[PDB]
Amino acid sequence: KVFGRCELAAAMKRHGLDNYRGYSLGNWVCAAKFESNFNTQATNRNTDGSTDYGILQINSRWWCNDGRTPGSRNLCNIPCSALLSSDITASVNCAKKIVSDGNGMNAWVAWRNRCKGTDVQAWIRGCRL
């Protein structure tokens, strides 16, 4: 499923992402956009054998288990297919763990190139809140 902007911001807020470890809500919305275009089914392969999964493009090298990334860890203790679900709960919970561990959000490449140090609030303006 593809979220709209405001629908995603809203769900992210309900999951307590707003200002989580210092990152205002537009940050998580912005990162979702440039990682997956708001698509819960997004997946992308990496050259090391790992795959990024879901709305926040969470990597199987470190964070989840997809049974085909040899020698990988599963630090969120979660199957990667759970990161592909229509309900974003697992993605959110895994995203919290990544950030709190942590490298903040700098871990997300697209967030670092398109969101960090810009007007991330534009991503939430005009939404019901």
Ligand SMILES: O=S(=O)(O)c1cc2c(O)c(c1)Cc1cc(S(=O)(=O)O)cc(c1O)Cc1cc(S(=O)(=O)O)cc(c1O)Cc1cc(S(=O)(=O)O)cc(c1O)C2
């Ligand atoms: O997209 S919207 O923010 O406009 C929206 C508002 C409400 C909605 O019921 C829905 C969307 C439909 C809907 C969407 C989703 S999601 O897109 O997958 O996030 C989930 C649900 C849902 O009804 C189920 C649901 C989950 C939660 S959560 O455990 O906190 O994530 C809370 C609620 C849910 O219905 C209650 C709820 C809260 C809120 S509020 O944003 O907290 O005011 C609005 C609406 C609600 O139904 C009222």
Ligand SMILES: O=S(=O)(O)c1cc2c(O)c(c1)Cc1cc(S(=O)(=O)O)cc(c1O)Cc1cc(S(=O)(=O)O)cc(c1O)Cc1cc(S(=O)(=O)O)cc(c1O)C2
């Ligand atoms: O990822 S975080 O947003 O939590 C973060 C915040 C600060 C940080 O200092 C860093 C990360 C570490 C860091 C990372 C990087 S990068 O991974 O290569 O993108 C670069 C730097 C850095 O300190 C160096 C740096 C770059 C820039 S830029 O011109 O915008 O690219 C600005 C700064 C830097 O220190 C200053 C700065 C800005 C910001 S702001 O969020 O843009 O206001 C937060 C922090 C800053 O130190 C305070």
